[PDB]
Amino acid sequence: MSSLSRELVFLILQFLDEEKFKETVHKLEQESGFFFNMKYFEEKVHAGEWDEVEKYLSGFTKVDDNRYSMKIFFEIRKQKYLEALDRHDRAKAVDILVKDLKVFSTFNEELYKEITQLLTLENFRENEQLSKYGDTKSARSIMLIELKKLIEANPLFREKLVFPTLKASRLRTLINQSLNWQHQLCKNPIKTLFTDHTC
């Protein structure tokens, strides 16, 4: 991508936000990979919307790109798993453990086993490492703080976390100039943006 193109995407991001198309803003963030929106990320983590969280992240990094991004996904999928156990859905917990968490076993065989063994506990809080995990609400929050740090320290995100500062509605202002440029070539005193204006 050119930096013109990249900047044009940012203009569009600002426009989309001002028109309050909220979902379109975050899809563009994700698909362009130009801006990672913390505030949005936090909101989705607290909400436990894990498929959206992973989908949003997938635009910025894969699971194995670097140790930071690896711990990020690991934390997300671990909490996913723990919540499944905590609602006593062991069918879902096992599905997670095979489809989501198995990838981490290659890199740590023993931890995967220890995590798997939580399936057989009455309460995973019987494990002393998990003995403190008290609320799904509180756990998510704890984990979120760690994710924020991991992202801010991840060198794949470092140039993506702060939105450029712009006058409100810059795209609309630029568009306006193009209408001025078009009319200043017409002699003499615009309906569509689809083809150049005349007189």
């Binding site: 140790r67 930071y68 690896m70 711990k71 690991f74 934390e75 671990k78 909490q79 981490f104 890199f107 740590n108 931890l111 220890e114 995590i115 490492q129 998990l130 995990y133 756990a139 704890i142 984990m143 760690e146 991991l150």
Partner: peptide, 8 residues
């Protein structure tokens, strides 16, 4: 820190 534990 970049270590895979559980949880903290």
């Amino acid at each position: 820190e970049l270590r895979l534990g559980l949880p903290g």
